[PDB]
RNA sequence: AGGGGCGUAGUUCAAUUGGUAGAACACCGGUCUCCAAAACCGGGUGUUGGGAGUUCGAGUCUCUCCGCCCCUGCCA
RNA sequence: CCGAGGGUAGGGCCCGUGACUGGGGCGAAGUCGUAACAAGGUAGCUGUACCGGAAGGUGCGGCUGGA
RNA sequence: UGGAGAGUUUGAUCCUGGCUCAGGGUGAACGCUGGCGGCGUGCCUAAGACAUGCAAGUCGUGCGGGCCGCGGGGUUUUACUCCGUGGUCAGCGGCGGACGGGUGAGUAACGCGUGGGUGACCUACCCGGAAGAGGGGGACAACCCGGGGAAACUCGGGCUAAUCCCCCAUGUGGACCCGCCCCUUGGGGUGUGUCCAAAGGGCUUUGCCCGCUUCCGGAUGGGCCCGCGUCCCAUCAGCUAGUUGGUGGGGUAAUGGCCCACCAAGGCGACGACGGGUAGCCGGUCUGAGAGGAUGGCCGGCCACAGGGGCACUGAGACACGGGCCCCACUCCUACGGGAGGCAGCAGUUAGGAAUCUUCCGCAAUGGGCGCAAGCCUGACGGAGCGACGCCGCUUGGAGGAAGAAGCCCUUCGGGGUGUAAACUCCUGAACCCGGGACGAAACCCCCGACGAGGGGACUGACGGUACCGGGGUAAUAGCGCCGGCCAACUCCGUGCCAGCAGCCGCGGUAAUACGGAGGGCGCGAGCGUUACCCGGAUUCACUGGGCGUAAAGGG
């Protein structure tokens, strides 16, 4: 009584970011109801169970990235719903470190806010090629030409961090209303009810523009872990979004990064939104029941590669670029004793900055060949992509140029 | 969820109900018998006894009582009805109990 | 597994010129024939008086190293010699002798026991027609040990065999130098084996 | 009732049944009444099935009920042969 | 994963108007001795938890990060 | 009638814990004295009794394992 | 065919005596290291709580039907829908669900072990003997109509079949009362009286096969009882009312205070009663010269238990692991009156802990249940998987190869070691490649023959394309402990009663074979060490086999 996942259309992960109280979640629950009627295989979610965590619920806000499944007769999507605020950025950044495309969300009444910025900024440093805006809260005071000013300054923001801002498809409407009628209108297609048709402008808007990225299942295998759950009577399940290759029940895999020595196992099962996946492929968002391992051994930040491909390494001499202060990065300099927080895939393990001979300083812009030793052995390869935050603002970005041990 | 072992249960209640009665009968019918044997009613006494020795021994054919059980009741109904028909009885109708 | 490592070094330590290479060990250089003292930074210094335990340990190591066996097998074998009837001091050697890879050595098919092994290990030998690759295999009396056909034409099988010309195998073995056969006629007696080892002591090391 | 069957022995991948009279309810390799033979389904030795007839017959003549594969063996040793 | 605490020499602890950090006992060094103990001289010996921030200058005020304790979460 | 279990009451044994309090073992070089070991400078030891910072002292009897 | 000691109290000695070491054993755990195969073996803690799936059914050759598709159209067509004949879903009826599988919580007990007793008894299915199987009557599901319910499902009315129940007859016989004979606790023969039997089903049809009924004999499996044996505390010394016995009743398959009235006053205890503690018991396991000591995990046997506590029903058998009824805790559902569950079955989760596994493959074999049989069910079982947990086998190479590279380490600066070790030259061939390819499986069944004996023929392989075999073919893992004495093995430097070692005695205070590192050496090797536990040494609870004047110990 679980059912097998029938992979028909291609899968793409889209996340939903943006400041607080701007409809991020509702707009999410919306896509559920909207895309529902016009096709089965969706399973409806509401503003309530999208945020099932007590407090998250009882208290009001969204605290953990959701994870919803809704399709179109065109393309199958997996919707990762990030939280607003700051504080939880460590949970949006992990949600973002996945999603192929980001459905940005701004509010007509408020306009681009402090978090609206950073989120976009994180997207430009996480690696979310492609953003879609969705002005929400439009059903507010007749703004003949005010909501227009939003799309004028929001685009300014996107084209302010290397994003096709002028091209970005800025749909308009309200999710509440859109939702509301649907809420009391289970069955019912588009080209009918007012606002409901405003959601589709967005959905379709996604089937287009937004890609479906160069994917391969020929290289080894890799899967950065986003979370780990203990499934009763089953065992330890680790989720994430696949990188290269594929994985099916019965395969060997190693858990690499953030521990003494890596443990190898055998996958006991795979799924995708509770659907018994027969063989998750790259770019797929899966769940992996790892044979006989404990929730004390798997941890968000390590990988699940194929045995023998990519070991854990602490010291790594890697080339790196440093965001200038104008880029909202660093406005000073660091010594050969600097200890920042790098972000490899979904994890951030703090490392040192043992700077090379003759570089008695490093300020905004710039990009030298400095070494570093992490305090937690993490799965590293040759050319891995990473960023460098600290204090509450990204400061650089580079890739492994060489590996020490 | 459930098993076709309830058939065995239902099946049971009946059989229960079955020999339950075949059993009550023998109790009552054997009381009345000695009550009349102590009283002296030699005739209508054996009349009943001999009619119980019947109901009893039939319990054995089935799964109610059985063998030595059935026989036991008897050797305490005759061994009894006889030790009563001595109270100035002279078993007139030597129906079942041989002299 | 089988020691594998410097050998004339053991030859040394023990003192008694041990034969673990066959060929060169008859040469003017068994090393023992060149530096008759124990290996190591010391080896040639006043030898203290050996505890009865040393004497026994040393006498056992001597014997055991002479076969290339591991302690596990060696002892386990000894313990069996205890149970069987008759002077175990003897039986033991008889069992150490009845070992397969050894008899391959005791027949010339191989210059040294280390070699005898590899030979046995790689099919090269044949017991009563069928081929055995178990060095540990216990040859029983009246059995025939012989080189496997696929091997006869090998540079080695030849020479070692070429040497058995005019030579005689231990009084308890028979040998057909022409056809690479050879029978395990009788279980060798303590006498028949001129070993530089006092089996009597080896028995003592294993009591207390 | 009392039966004549095979009770396993030997090692894994080396079946070595023992022909035995025993209450049907006893577990397989459990305790029996009497031992009457052995049967190596892999026949290794000109001695792959011994069976005491005299006794095998006693049991049969009292109720002992053989298995199909236990009759074949019994028979093969000629338990029924009368002439 | 989200809250809240705690980290000053060796060991207990004080300086929070923002100003190189002392107080006791330890401890090291020297003299005497085989060597200590005692005695007598002489020396804070610190990663203020790490790294940055603001600052003319941070134990203190910001922030990020490490370890530990406490509460609340957490079914592919 | 019997009857698992529940209740009211009064006992018995056990595991843990408690303000305070008794002595004990152990811990290089802190204080007081000097009881024993040589009439150990009052022969020693002992049962008992009383007294004393502490070792101990005294009484009565006993022992020699004191001369 | 069987017996070894050593270190340590002293300035030294002999004795006493304790501690400790050398051996062996383990369901191990922990550290470092880890290549292969086979056979074993793997929750010692929470008898804690557990999602999910699966672990017990099977017979139409017992019976009637519901449904789907074919034979002839009852009639001439659809109508009172009748048969022929294999698939399907329950029902009724039989036999099995009491065995197989799990566990050790409880239990100091005739629970177990051992040898006996039953004139005091039971035994389904299975064999062997004897006798029958004659007639009659009826109900209840299934199904149809109605009513209630969210659901789990239950109530009213109406038929209906049987190997279902019931009643009479026959009575080889069997049961019961009284009497006689023999025997001697209730057993064997016997007499008058009374009471009790049964079912048809399939065919190849006055005969077979399968059932049925009663009775005797036999097997197998059991109940009960008795002698003897079975841990600690006596700082547990007195215990007992169903208490001990009797008589008469109830109960049972059967003896019995097993249960009850009545009468009596007993029963038990230093030969350890009563109480408290701990514990499943044995075959066996480990150790020991033995006598002993310790132990009860694999496997086999017996007991006991199935969430906790009690109960009876059916039944040859249970007071029943995946049956029922009640109570309790707990978890779950609801349409709020009632429903659901119990992995100490398999696999698995979590909690606890130093620690103990796959949600596997297959009924091919062996065993079990039902069946005429085909065959269906079989997490028994046969296999595979994971872990050096264990034992055993196997590899990391073999033969040459210098008065002897280098690097490192000692150095009386002459030289010495690591060392044939390396390099190097050949030689072999783990791996890998290609190819064939199992044993385990002959019988159920069919055929000549009486479904007799006997003969011939056919199907069936999870493990596995594995094992094993042949062809070609690459040098292709090594670690861990230790070196003061006991105990196999020594030098340099660093450190300086510091840091640290340590099983016991002890090492370290500026030349440390004892600390840390290095070179060297010894031991073992896919392992080596550590901790824990048992026996041994320990004649150190002494039966074998000790002692007490002053060593512990003679009682005032
Ligand atoms: N274990 C000692 C027992 O207690 C008493 O002895 C205890 C004390 O009286 C004795 O004290 C002595 C003192 O007497 C002497 N004059 C000076 C010495 N420094 C102290 O020593 C004691 O204290 C020091 C710390 O100050 C510890 O390091 C030492 O180990 C300890 N024994 O030390 C003992 C504690 O270890 C009894 N007299 C003795 O008979 C008894 O067995
Ligand atoms: N007027 C208006 N209010 C809306 C709209 N969409 C959402 N809201 C309001 O915002 C509330 C919750 O918004 P939500 O979607 O959870 O915000 P969010 O983007 O998840 C903010 P965070 O994730 O950081 O907690 C709704 O209950 C509603 O009152 C809209 O389109 N118009
Ligand atoms: Mg939200
Ligand atoms: Zn040599």
């Amino acid at each position: 009584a679980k059912g097998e996942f029938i992979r028909t259309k291609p899968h793409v992960n889209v996340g939903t970011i943006g400041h607080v109280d701007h409809g991020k979640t509702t707009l999410t629950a919306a896509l559920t109801f909207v895309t529902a009627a016009e096709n089965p295989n969706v399973e409806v979610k509401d503003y309530g169970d999208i945020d099932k965590a007590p407090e998250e619920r009882a208290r009001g806000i969204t605290i953990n990235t959701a994870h919803v499944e809704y399709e179109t007769a065109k393309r199958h999507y997996s919707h990762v719903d990030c939280p607003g605020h700051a504080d939880y950025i460590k949970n949006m950044i992990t949600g973002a470190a996945q999603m192929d495309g980001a459905i940005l969300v701004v509010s007509a009444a408020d306009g681009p806010m402090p978090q609206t910025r950073e989120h976009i900024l994180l997207a430009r440093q996480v690696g979310v090629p492609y953003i879609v805006v969705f002005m929400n809260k439009v059903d507010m005071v007749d703004d003949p030409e005010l909501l227009d000013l939003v799309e004028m300054e929001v685009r300014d923001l996107l084209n302010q961090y290397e994003f096709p801002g002028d091209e970005v498809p800025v749909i308009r409407g309200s999710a509440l209303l859109a939702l509301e009628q649907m809420h009391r209108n289970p069955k019912t297609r588009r080209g009918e009810n007012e606002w409901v048709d405003k959601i589709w402008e967005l959905l379709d808007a996604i089937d287009e523009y937004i890609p479906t990225p160069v994917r391969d299942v020929d290289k080894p295998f890799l899967m950065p872990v986003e979370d780990v759950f203990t499934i009763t009577g089953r065992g330890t399940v680790a989720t994430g979004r696949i990188e290269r290759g594929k994985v099916k029940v019965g395969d060997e895999v190693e858990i690499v990064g953030l521990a003494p020595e890596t443990r190898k196992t055998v996958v006991t099962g795979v799924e995708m939104h509770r659907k018994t996946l027969q063989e998750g492929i790259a770019g797929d968002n899966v769940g992996v029941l790892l044979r006989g391992v404990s929730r004390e051994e798997v941890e968000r930040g390590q990988v699940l590669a194929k045995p023998g491909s990519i070991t854990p390494h602490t010291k790594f001499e890697a080339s790196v670029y440093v965001l200038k202060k104008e880029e909202g990065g660093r406005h000073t300099g660091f010594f050969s004793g600097y200890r920042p927080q790098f972000y490899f895939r979904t994890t951030d393990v703090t490392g040192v900055v043992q700077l090379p001979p003759g570089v008695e300083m490093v300020m905004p812009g710039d990009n030298v060949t400095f070494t570093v030793e992490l305090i937690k052995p993490v799965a590293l390869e040759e050319g891995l992509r990473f960023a460098i935050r600290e204090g509450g603002r990204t400061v650089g970005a580079g890739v492994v140029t060489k590996i020490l041990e | 969820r459930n098993l076709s072992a309830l058939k065995r249960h239902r099946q049971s209640l009946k059989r229960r109900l079955r020999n339950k009665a075949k059993k009550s009968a023998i109790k009552t019918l054997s009381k009345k018998a000695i009550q009349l044997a102590q009283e002296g009613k030699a005739e209508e006494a054996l009349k009943i006894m001999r009619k119980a020795e019947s109901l009893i021994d039939k319990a054995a054919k089935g799964s109610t009582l059985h063998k030595n059980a059935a026989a036991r009741r008897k050797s305490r109904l005759m061994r009894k009805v006889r030790q009563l028909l001595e109270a100035a009885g002279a078993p007139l109708i030597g129906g079942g109990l041989s002299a | 597994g089988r020691y594998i490592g410097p050998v004339c070094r053991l030859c040394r330590r023990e003192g008694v010129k041990l034969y673990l290479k066959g060929e060169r060990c008859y040469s003017p250089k068994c090393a023992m024939e060149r530096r008759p003292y124990p290996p190591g930074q010391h080896g040639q210094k006043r030898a203290r008086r050996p505890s009865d335990y040393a004497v026994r340990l040393r006498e056992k190591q001597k014997l055991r190293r002479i076969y290339g066996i591991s302690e596990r097998q060696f002892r386990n074998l000894f313990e069996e010699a205890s149970k069987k009837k008759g002077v175990t001091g003897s039986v033991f050697l008889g069992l150490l002798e009845s070992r397969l890879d050894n008899v391959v050595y005791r027949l010339g098919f191989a210059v040294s026991r280390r070699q005898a092994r590899q030979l046995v290990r790689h099919g090269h030998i044949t017991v009563n027609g069928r081929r055995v690759d178990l060095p540990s295999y216990r040859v029983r009396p009246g059995d025939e040990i012989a080189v496997a056909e696929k091997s006869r034409n090998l540079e080695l099988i030849r020479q070692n065999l070429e040497a058995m010309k005019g030579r005689k195998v231990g009084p308890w073995l028979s040998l057909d130098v022409e056809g690479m056969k050879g029978k395990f006629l009788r279980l060798p007696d303590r006498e028949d084996l001129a070993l530089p080892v006092n089996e009597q002591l080896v028995i003592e090391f294993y009591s207390r | 009732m009392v039966k004549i069957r095979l009770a396993r022995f030997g090692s894994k991948h080396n079946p070595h049944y023992r022909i035995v009279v025993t209450d049907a309810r006893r577990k397989r390799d459990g305790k029996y009444i009497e031992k009457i033979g052995y049967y190596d389904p892999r026949k290794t030795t000109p001695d792959w099935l011994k069976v005491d007839v005299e006794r095998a017959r006693y049991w049969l003549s009292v109720g002992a009920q053989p298995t199909d594969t236990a009759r074949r063996l019994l028979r093969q040793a000629g338990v029924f042969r009368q002439e």
Side-chain angles (χ1 to χ4, degrees):
Chain A
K2 202 190 302 175
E4 317 181 315
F5 191 65
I6 292 88
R7 57 164 61 273
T8 50
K9 308 294 176 175
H11 178 197
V12 179
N13 313 327
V14 65
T16 161
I17 56 177
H19 196 90
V20 331
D21 271 39
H22 287 183
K24 204 182 305 73
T25 315
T26 24
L27 165 54
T28 296
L31 311 191
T32 302
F33 296 99
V34 165
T35 68
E38 212 288 283
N39 246 66
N41 314 108
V42 72
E43 299 221 63
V44 149
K45 301 305 165 193
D46 192 3
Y47 184 25
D49 45 10
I50 283 289
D51 267 359
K52 29 57 204 309
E55 161 186 36
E56 226 194 7
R57 228 166 38 209
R59 175 184 176 189
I61 53 186
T62 310
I63 289 174
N64 309 302
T65 25
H67 273 308
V68 279
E69 148 200 291
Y70 58 64
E71 68 150 295
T72 72
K74 303 180 288 297
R75 180 196 287 174
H76 177 304
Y77 294 110
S78 219
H79 196 215
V80 176
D81 169 44
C82 296
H85 298 84
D87 306 72
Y88 314 158
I89 165 186
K90 194 192 74 179
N91 297 303
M92 85 116 265
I93 287 184
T94 311
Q98 311 190 301
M99 60 200 276
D100 306 317
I103 304 176
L104 183 37
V105 189
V106 183
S107 143
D110 247 318
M113 297 288 243
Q115 296 305 143
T116 297
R117 190 180 299 80
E118 288 206 300
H119 276 187
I120 282 176
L121 172 50
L122 288 176
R124 177 66 270 176
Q125 288 292 61
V126 168
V128 186
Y130 293 71
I131 270 185
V132 158
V133 178
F134 177 85
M135 223 175 298
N136 201 54
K137 304 238 292 278
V138 227
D139 64 311
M140 304 297 108
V141 341
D142 285 296
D143 307 296
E145 155 264 34
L146 194 63
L147 70 179
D148 289 285
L149 184 59
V150 172
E151 195 174 314
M152 213 299 136
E153 50 179 20
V154 175
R155 289 180 185 295
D156 175 290
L157 197 61
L158 287 167
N159 292 305
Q160 186 179 310
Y161 290 151
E162 283 74 314
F163 285 77
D166 301 304
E167 289 79 357
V168 173
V170 180
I171 297 74
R172 294 185 175 188
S174 88
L176 183 46
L177 295 174
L179 193 63
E180 293 199 305
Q181 289 169 333
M182 284 256 64
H183 203 69
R184 181 56 183 84
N185 172 196
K187 308 170 177 297
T188 264
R189 301 174 179 184
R190 65 183 291 186
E192 181 192 304
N193 179 305
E194 168 56 67
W195 312 95
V196 181
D197 290 56
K198 275 80 289 294
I199 267 50
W200 284 96
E201 279 201 305
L202 179 66
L203 253 152
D204 280 295
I206 307 178
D207 287 284
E208 15 238 293
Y209 190 49
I210 233 178
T212 165
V214 179
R215 216 157 293 177
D216 96 62
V217 317
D218 266 47
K219 273 187 176 182
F221 167 59
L222 191 89
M223 192 216 95
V225 190
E226 65 183 340
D227 204 341
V228 181
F229 308 63
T230 291
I231 304 312
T232 286
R234 301 280 24 210
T236 299
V237 160
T239 41
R241 193 270 262 80
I242 311 192
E243 214 60 312
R244 55 172 137 297
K246 49 193 174 182
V247 286
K248 40 177 282 55
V249 176
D251 303 331
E252 237 78 40
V253 295
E254 298 185 309
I255 307 166
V256 182
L258 312 190
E261 53 199 305
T262 53
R263 180 182 172 65
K264 191 173 88 293
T265 332
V266 176
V267 304
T268 271
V270 183
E271 292 189 1
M272 176 166 272
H273 297 285
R274 271 107 47 183
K275 328 288 184 174
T276 306
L277 207 328
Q278 230 304 281
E279 178 185 58
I281 65 166
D284 255 325
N285 183 300
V286 308
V288 177
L289 186 52
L290 307 172
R291 174 121 73 195
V293 313
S294 56
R295 197 173 189 175
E296 181 181 287
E297 299 188 66
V298 176
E299 227 243 66
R300 160 182 172 166
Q302 52 201 203
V303 193
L304 277 166
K306 188 245 170 178
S309 68
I310 264 58
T311 3
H313 303 295
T314 59
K315 306 206 66 169
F316 72 102
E317 115 81 15
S319 189
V320 173
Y321 172 69
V322 176
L323 285 59
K324 200 282 137 56
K325 101 90 165 298
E326 310 276 59
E327 290 173 289
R330 289 191 54 58
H331 58 60
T332 32
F334 51 112
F335 292 109
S336 66
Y338 188 58
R339 304 180 77 171
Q341 299 68 201
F342 311 69
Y343 282 61
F344 309 71
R345 309 180 190 75
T346 39
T347 186
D348 62 295
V349 294
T350 308
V352 194
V353 182
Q354 297 180 336
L355 218 176
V359 198
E360 208 73 11
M361 206 192 312
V362 175
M363 319 195 110
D366 183 70
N367 39 38
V368 195
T369 305
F370 71 77
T371 307
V372 41
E373 184 197 305
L374 313 162
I375 65 176
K376 268 194 166 71
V378 26
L380 289 173
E381 54 186 304
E382 206 177 11
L384 185 65
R385 290 181 176 186
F386 72 85
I388 297 181
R389 292 201 73 209
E390 165 285 299
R393 64 185 311 170
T394 303
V395 316
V399 301
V400 192
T401 189
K402 288 185 176 185
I403 246 177
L404 206 290
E405 290 180 57
Chain B
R1 273 277 190 65
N2 297 304
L3 165 64
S4 173
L6 337 191
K7 182 173 70 188
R8 271 297 201 173
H9 191 210
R10 291 183 289 247
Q11 223 164 292
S12 177
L13 292 178
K14 301 178 195 171
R15 331 173 74 98
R16 166 219 188 313
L17 189 275
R18 190 181 310 317
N19 41 192
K20 201 314 158 199
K22 304 189 61 181
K23 202 160 171 58
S24 308
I26 311 177
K27 292 172 189 165
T28 46
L29 209 289
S30 294
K31 280 173 52 188
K32 245 179 161 194
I34 16 184
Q35 201 170 177
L36 313 191
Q38 139 266 304
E39 180 180 356
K41 306 292 190 60
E43 178 159 71
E44 57 197 308
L46 287 76
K47 202 186 304 164
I48 309 302
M49 167 188 96
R50 175 168 54 276
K51 182 179 241 175
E53 161 179 354
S54 175
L55 249 168
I56 273 184
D57 265 320
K58 279 202 168 193
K61 298 185 307 170
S63 317
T64 306
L65 292 178
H66 239 282
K67 64 282 178 177
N68 328 294
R72 205 180 68 227
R73 303 187 169 297
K74 288 158 56 180
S75 62
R76 292 184 187 175
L77 188 51
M78 310 187 132
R79 174 178 148 63
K80 187 71 179 189
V81 160
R82 187 159 197 169
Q83 299 302 305
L84 302 179
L85 285 186
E86 127 298 336
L92 278 170
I93 295 61
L97 206 185
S98 76
Chain C
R2 28 73 47 55
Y3 180 17
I4 293 175
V7 273
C8 265
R9 128 193 272 296
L10 310 183
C11 270
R12 299 222 257 139
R13 169 59 63 182
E14 248 59 287
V16 165
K17 191 190 177 206
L18 237 74
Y19 295 104
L20 321 165
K21 277 176 167 298
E23 240 292 306
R24 168 188 237 207
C25 262
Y26 288 118
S27 291
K29 42 193 173 181
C30 184
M32 185 73 100
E33 183 62 90
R34 205 159 171 148
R35 338 156 64 187
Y37 45 66
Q41 168 178 56
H42 301 294
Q44 48 202 311
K45 304 164 69 181
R46 201 186 202 183
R48 321 262 79 178
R49 221 282 260 188
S51 70
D52 306 281
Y53 175 83
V55 181
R56 305 210 177 89
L57 187 266
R58 284 277 69 81
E59 211 53 31
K60 182 210 71 174
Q61 290 298 286
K62 207 179 293 198
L63 169 54
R64 182 165 88 64
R65 288 172 174 178
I66 285 169
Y67 289 82
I69 294 190
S70 57
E71 179 61 18
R72 176 69 71 168
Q73 280 176 296
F74 190 86
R75 176 173 203 126
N76 213 271
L77 229 165
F78 166 93
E79 298 292 355
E80 169 187 356
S82 293
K83 304 303 167 187
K84 184 192 166 186
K85 297 298 175 56
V87 183
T88 84
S90 303
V91 194
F92 192 30
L93 300 149
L95 264 48
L96 267 174
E97 220 51 64
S98 294
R99 194 194 191 65
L100 179 56
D101 54 350
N102 174 60
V103 176
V104 179
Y105 171 82
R106 277 304 210 295
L107 248 42
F109 303 165
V111 62
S112 72
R113 296 189 171 92
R114 317 251 289 191
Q115 199 190 78
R117 200 194 198 71
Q118 181 154 72
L119 270 208
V120 188
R121 169 114 241 67
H122 301 185
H124 303 307
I125 284 60
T126 286
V127 175
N128 288 186
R130 298 91 72 179
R131 77 90 175 288
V132 178
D133 55 311
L134 278 24
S136 37
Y137 185 89
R138 219 146 81 192
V139 182
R140 302 175 57 185
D143 289 31
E144 297 170 0
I145 325 298
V147 182
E149 123 292 351
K150 183 205 170 184
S151 305
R152 298 197 175 197
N153 55 49
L154 284 162
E155 304 184 17
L156 293 61
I157 329 304
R158 302 272 200 60
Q159 298 136 329
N160 296 311
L161 233 301
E162 182 63 356
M164 310 306 296
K165 302 252 197 178
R167 283 52 185 174
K168 296 159 65 173
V169 176
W172 71 92
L173 305 170
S174 73
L175 195 56
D176 186 287
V177 187
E178 302 179 68
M180 279 91 119
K181 284 187 302 171
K183 296 159 134 293
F184 185 68
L185 297 172
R186 184 180 86 286
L187 193 166
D189 151 51
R190 155 82 159 72
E191 220 69 5
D192 305 317
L193 297 318
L195 268 59
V197 103
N198 174 330
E199 59 293 317
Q200 243 315 301
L201 292 196
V202 159
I203 302 183
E204 288 178 5
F205 175 100
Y206 283 115
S207 311
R208 191 237 75 156
Chain D
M1 75 293 254
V2 31
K3 307 190 62 174
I4 308 186
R5 48 166 156 171
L6 270 45
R8 202 183 209 258
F9 282 115
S11 324
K12 190 208 291 180
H13 294 321
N14 181 62
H16 257 88
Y17 312 83
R18 216 180 277 185
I19 306 301
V20 60
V21 47
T22 146
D23 190 312
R25 314 196 280 312
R26 279 303 194 190
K27 91 225 310 164
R28 181 152 68 71
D29 298 2
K31 172 191 181 172
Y32 41 87
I33 305 286
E34 191 164 309
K35 173 278 185 193
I36 46 197
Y38 51 90
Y39 151 70
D40 170 5
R42 302 203 283 162
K43 328 148 199 169
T44 25
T45 281
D47 181 75
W48 58 300
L49 171 54
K50 201 244 77 181
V51 166
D52 177 351
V53 299
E54 317 287 338
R55 288 271 81 193
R57 287 179 187 176
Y58 167 99
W59 284 112
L60 288 169
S61 70
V62 270
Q65 278 288 169
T67 300
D68 290 311
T69 159
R71 201 153 225 156
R72 156 188 148 205
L73 287 180
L74 269 177
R75 176 212 315 303
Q76 194 161 175
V79 196
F80 313 74
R81 187 172 309 187
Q82 91 272 43
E83 301 307 280

